[PDB]
């Protein structure tokens, strides 16, 4: 009966942005004040709804999307953005009604050699639809020779790792993101 936000905000591991995790929140009491009365979040932006009025509203569905990206990509998690994350990994719709929450996770998600656990899609022929997920790992044929499932020249694997390292600059450091969607009335 107490809605499971601690499971979402404090999972030991977060998903890769290309394989972003969706957790449905339904049929329980949620105290959203624990989020908005925290000062440990580096981004807290709500579109079409104010976070202070959330405890007072009734929603049919609530979804909590969660993933890791890097610092200078956090601006792509918003309606009407373009870029690698917005176009190929996680696309928010223009009419998004919800909250985007992010914080620096450099202590958790960096390793000294480089964390190769967290991945992103590098390229896609066409842009993702809003809230679409593409987890395919098809070799991309950039030339006229068929790739035949193997990486080669003009034959490219569509993902790469962030390689997070503690000594990276804040732009390249890992940031954990939670996107709360609200389906109204």
């Amino acid at each position, epitope marked *: 009966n107490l809605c499971p936000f601690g499971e979402v905000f404090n999972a030991t591991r977060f998903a890769s942005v290309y394989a972003w995790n969706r957790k449905r929140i339904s049929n329980c009491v949620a105290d959203y004040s624990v*989020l*908005y009365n925290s000062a440990s*979040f580096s981004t*807290f*932006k*709500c*579109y079409g*709804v*104010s*976070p*202070t*009025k959330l405890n007072d509203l009734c929603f049919t569905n609530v979804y909590a999307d969660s993933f890791v990206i890097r610092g*200078d*990509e956090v*601006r*792509q998690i*918003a*309606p*009407g*953005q*373009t*870029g690698k994350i917005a176009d190929y990994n996680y696309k928010l*719709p*223009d*009419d998004f009604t919800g909250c985007v929450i992010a914080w620096n996770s450099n202590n958790l998600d960096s390793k000294v050699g480089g964390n190769y656990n967290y991945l992103y899609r590098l390229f896609r022929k066409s842009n993702l639809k809003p809230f679409e997920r593409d987890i395919s790992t098809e070799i991309y044929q950039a030339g006229s020779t068929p790739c035949n499932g193997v990486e080669g020249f003009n034959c490219y694997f569509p993902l790469q790792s962030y390689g997070f390292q503690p000594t990276n600059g804040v732009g390249y450091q890992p940031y954990r993101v939670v996107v709360l969607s609200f389906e109204l009335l």
Partner: antibody
Amino acid sequence: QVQLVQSGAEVKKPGASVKVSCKASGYIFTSYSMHWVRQAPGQGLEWMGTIKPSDDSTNYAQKFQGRVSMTRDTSTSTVYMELSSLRYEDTAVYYCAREARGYYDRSGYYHPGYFDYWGQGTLVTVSS
Amino acid sequence: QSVLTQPASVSGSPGQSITISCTGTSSDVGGYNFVSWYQQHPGKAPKLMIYEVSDRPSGVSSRFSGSKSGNTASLTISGLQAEDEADYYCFSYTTSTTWVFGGGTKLTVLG
């Protein structure tokens, strides 16, 4: 991809009116406000006003109040700026610009947007 | 509303830091943190460099930076380059619920 395509160059006598269009595509038309900004040749940018296509609300700069009408056709994703009683100093390039969506911060204050896409501009020349 | 005051022009040598000032009033630049800075090359629409005093949209170099003290907003361009030769305009919200542009500054790159 977001594109704003404006109507073509206009030539008008003083006291006439002009209606410039701005056709939007590649996004949900009703999710973003549109603003009009003009620039006389060689001179600065001048904010004219804005329309919010969701509810059809408008807000004009005072020096245009009573003279400008901003409308919208959702069936065609088009915003219009109509300027009446044209003067010689109305000679300018008129731009439609889209405002990125604003947001509410953690303590509930509203932050408005900024201009993220622009039309190509429409020259209006007012001469006798 | 009161048009925001900027220097007609500034200049700097490549590699150096220049600063363009925008001074309005307590009812605009002093009234709110909704100050934006726009770049404009000849014959082209304006391009957003800075919004909300100091934030950058995606795709804009960290060389562009914004600050604000009292009624004056500052755009600072570091590591100056030839492609930065443009007009620059501040833009603010006003207590009348309108928006107003500054008069604009011509940046020239020496050398």
